[PDB]
Amino acid sequence: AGNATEVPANSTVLSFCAFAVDAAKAYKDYLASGGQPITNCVKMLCTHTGTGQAITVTPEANMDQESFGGASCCLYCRCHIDHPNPKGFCDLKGKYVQIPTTCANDPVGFTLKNTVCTVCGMWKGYGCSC
Amino acid sequence: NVTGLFKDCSKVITGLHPTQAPTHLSVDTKFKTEGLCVDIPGIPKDMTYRRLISMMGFKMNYQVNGYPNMFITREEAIRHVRAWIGFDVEGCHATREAVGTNLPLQLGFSTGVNLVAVPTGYVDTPNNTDFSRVSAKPPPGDQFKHLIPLMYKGLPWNVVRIKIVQMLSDTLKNLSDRVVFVLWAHGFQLTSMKYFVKIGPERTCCLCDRRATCFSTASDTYACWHHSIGFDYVYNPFMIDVQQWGFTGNLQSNHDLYCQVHGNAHVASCDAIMTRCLAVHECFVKR
Ligand SMILES: [Cl-]
Ligand SMILES: [Zn+2]
Ligand SMILES: [Zn+2]
Ligand SMILES: [Zn+2]
Ligand SMILES: [Zn+2]
């Protein structure tokens, strides 16, 4: 009974991060040791005529980005573990997230490793010009 | 194709909105086209769901530089025989609002200790995964109906895990610098360890030079077995699955080939005692 959410290619990485004290460091270290990035993310069919903003209520990829469902790019959502926000809110769940196409092979790692500029709404280093 | 790890055990017939779905598989079919997902303005996210997520199916087969083994070789286990603690868990089954996964009910150790936990699961919501009590039933069968009263005599997991850490610390502080959980099969034992184990790089005690065996979520500190009062998590335990050593047949039948002083009392601690007992015989009896 029940409905699978996951594929076996993700079992090891999700198990490792689901037990880690520091899940973010564990994922980063897993990748650094040659682990495969988390797959089975919610990739969006979109126009690629979007604003390029990082986190949006509709897909907003431009021609240099892919758009994904937000929860599916969040390590804490993927492992069903506690979020860093003490109120238990996710930065991504309930929104779409834009990932540079060069990094779209690992959206979870990209969002883990990078920061959105709250002033201009673009990723620092990938769009923020402040 | 798929795994049962993080299987959605809810009885909801629709899937998730693309912004809330953890995975492509879990997105509702209305949004799927051309192997991708689309956003549909006017079909918004859902703000009231509670979806039980199965923790059955962990796979601890990684190699990450700077992180130790969890499962250890027989030779390493033998070296650390003073650290052996048999561990077994009796489960109950999700029911009513969810169906299709098993929750830890009675945790037993070769110290003879049994601890009963409130049936508790990981519930996905529109926000943080909620660790919470869930409806449960005994496994089907007349031989399980004695578990029914235990489903109303359990302790909350925050208490259970403090008691596990205290039990292991009192048992092991003058025996070993670590714990080796000795298991018969490992899937549900590993599921249960999700509730009370954390892992990471090897650490040292905050109060002495010994390696850390325990972690405290309240203080984000690490302790050895001597300094762990109040700590709630077992940190970097080791473990080994005795069933994988070539046996055919079940635990009791193999245990009883060597030993006549552990009659089967049909309870988790007794399974844990027989598991460590069988392990000692198999590893050390000279043939
Ligand atoms: Cl070690
Ligand atoms: Zn999240
Ligand atoms: Zn900016
Ligand atoms: Zn210490
Ligand atoms: Zn025995």
Residue numbers in the entry:
A (entry chain M): 1 to 130
B (entry chain A): 3 to 289
Please give sentences taken from the publication describing this entry:
SARS-CoV-2 nonstructural protein 14 (nsp14) exoribonuclease (ExoN) plays important roles in the proofreading during viral RNA synthesis and the evasion of host immune responses. The multifunctional SARS-CoV-2 nsp14 consists of the N-terminal ExoN domain involved in proofreading and the C-terminal N7-MTase domain that functions in mRNA capping.
We obtained crystals under two different conditions, one containing ammonium tartrate and the other containing magnesium chloride (MgCl2), albeit in the same crystal form. The structures were determined by molecular replacement phasing and refined to 1.64- and 2.10-Å resolution for the tartrate and magnesium-bound crystals, respectively. While our structures of SARS-CoV-2 ExoN–nsp10 obtained in the two different crystallization conditions are highly similar, they show notable differences in the exonuclease active site located around the “knuckles” of ExoN. Glu92 is pointed away from Asp90/Asp273 and hydrogen bonded to Gln108 side chain, whereas His268, in turn, is flipped away from Glu92. These observations demonstrate high flexibility of the ExoN active site in the absence of divalent metal cofactors. Notably, we observed ordered tartrate ions from the crystallization condition bound to this basic patch in our crystal structure, potentially mimicking RNA backbone phosphate interactions.
